[PDB]
Amino acid sequence: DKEFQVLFVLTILTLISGTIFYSTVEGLRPIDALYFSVVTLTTVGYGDFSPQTDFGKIFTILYIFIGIGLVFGFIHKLAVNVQLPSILSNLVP
Amino acid sequence: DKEFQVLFVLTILTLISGTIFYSTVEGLRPIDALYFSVVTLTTVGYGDFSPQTDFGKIFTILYIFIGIGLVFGFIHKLAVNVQLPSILSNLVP
Amino acid sequence: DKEFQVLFVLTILTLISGTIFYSTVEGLRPIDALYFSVVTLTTVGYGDFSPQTDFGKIFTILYIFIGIGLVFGFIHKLAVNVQLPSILSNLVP
Amino acid sequence: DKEFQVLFVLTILTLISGTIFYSTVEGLRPIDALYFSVVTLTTVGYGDFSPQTDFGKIFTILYIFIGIGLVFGFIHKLAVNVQLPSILSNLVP
Numbered sequence: 129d130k131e132f133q134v135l136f137v138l139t140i141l142t143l144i145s146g147t148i149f150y151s152t153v154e155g156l157r158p159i160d161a162l163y164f165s166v167v168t169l170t171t172v173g174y175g176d177f178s179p180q181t182d183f184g185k186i187f188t189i190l191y192i193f194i195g196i197g198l199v200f201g202f203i204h205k206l207a208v209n210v211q212l213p214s215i216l217s218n219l220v221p
Numbered sequence: 222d223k224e225f226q227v228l229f230v231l232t233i234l235t236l237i238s239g240t241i242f243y244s245t246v247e248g249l250r251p252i253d254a255l256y257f258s259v260v261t262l263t264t265v266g267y268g269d270f271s272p273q274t275d276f277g278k279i280f281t282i283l284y285i286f287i288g289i290g291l292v293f294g295f296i297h298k299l300a301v302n303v304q305l306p307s308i309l310s311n312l313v314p
Numbered sequence: 315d316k317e318f319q320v321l322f323v324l325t326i327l328t329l330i331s332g333t334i335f336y337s338t339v340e341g342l343r344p345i346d347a348l349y350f351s352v353v354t355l356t357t358v359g360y361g362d363f364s365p366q367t368d369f370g371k372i373f374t375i376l377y378i379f380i381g382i383g384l385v386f387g388f389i390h391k392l393a394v395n396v397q398l399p400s401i402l403s404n405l406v407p
Numbered sequence: 408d409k410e411f412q413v414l415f416v417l418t419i420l421t422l423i424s425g426t427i428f429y430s431t432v433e434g435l436r437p438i439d440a441l442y443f444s445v446v447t448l449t450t451v452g453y454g455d456f457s458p459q460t461d462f463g464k465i466f467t468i469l470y471i472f473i474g475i476g477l478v479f480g481f482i483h484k485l486a487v488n489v490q491l492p493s494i495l496s497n498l499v500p
């Protein structure tokens with residue numbers, strides 16, 4: 129429970145950093161920066177948005193390496209410690 | 222066995238939600254909406270389709286976080302509890 | 315060892331199916347079809363190639379769900395049962 | 408600790424190979440080649456860069472299969488043996 133809260137906060141902070149960075153350096157609207165940060169760290173990578181500056185490319189390399197781990201950690205705990213219990217409870221005959 | 226059936230249903234429901242959402246808000250043909258939902262949740266992300274509206278971008282963020290876990294859960298069980306047994310049986314000398 | 319050989323063969327067969335399908339239905343050159351199949355099943359998804367026909371989109375949905383599991387199974391075993399031993403042996407003082 | 412250092416070095420070497428290959432065969436600037444190599448091995452795959460030559464497509468297939476395992480191995484150890492301890496220490500009441 130507290131573990132999920134910590135990953136939640138960590139993920140939020142990571143996404144906030146990405147939103148601030150891409151909106152500033154890559155000139156994206158804040159919503160697009162947040163959306164791009166999520167699409168990046170979850171490894172979907174549509175490419176509708178991508179860094180055009182070298183500063184952006186370098187940050188993206190570091191952002192991915194440092195963010196993928198926590199984002200997927202949060203996703204795992206969300207599905208196993210939150211979603212799983214709910215589906216099971218919806219079964220209880 | 223029953224576990225696989227539950228993940229199967231859950232995945233179907235998740236994909237149906239995506240199909241309805243993207244066909245309505247993003248104006249995609251139903252087949253393209255389903256295809257896009259799958260390409261998104263499996264993290265392939267070709268980008269041949271991507272949300273153009275803010276409503277679509279926000280939903281996509283939430284859809285990914287909530288759907289990746291179950292989709293990959295189903296994929297895992299499919300390969301370990303269904304595909305694996307079959308390949309092994311095809312070996313039995 | 316034999317496990318790695320089985321996953322190797324399974325991966326080859328899966329990629330051959332994709333190569334045949336995309337070169338025929340989507341009209342790609344065989345090399346591009348193989349390349350696209352790999353980029354798809356490893357979830358990279360550049361999007362330089364993507365299915366344009368409904369037949370192709372439907373097959374892609376099924377191909378991903380059935381192929382991701384085995385492809386990543388092979389990748390895991392390759393890194394743990396082949397690459398890992400080699401790096402360790404290159405260390406042995 | 409030493410495990411993390413080995414994966415660190417291995418990842419560096421893998422990325423250096425990609426940087427050299429794509430800058431030479433695909434004609435990318437070194438920074439773009441490094442960026443593309445990272446985007447590829449972490450499976451993000453934006454597609455802003457992608458191999459245009461057959462030599463590049465073939466290398467990419469092999470690069471992905473051999474590199475994804477080590478890159479994600481490093482990411483895992485980075486998050487579990489480096490990031491995790493730090494966040495926990497930042498909690499210690």
Ligand SMILES: [K+]
Nearest residue numbers: 172265358451
């Ligand atoms: K991807």
Ligand SMILES: [K+]
Nearest residue numbers: 171264357450
């Ligand atoms: K991916």
Ligand SMILES: [K+]
Nearest residue numbers: 173266359452
């Ligand atoms: K992608």
Ligand SMILES: [K+]
Nearest residue numbers: 175268361454
């Ligand atoms: K494009």
Ligand SMILES: [K+]
Nearest residue numbers: 174267360453
């Ligand atoms: K893409």
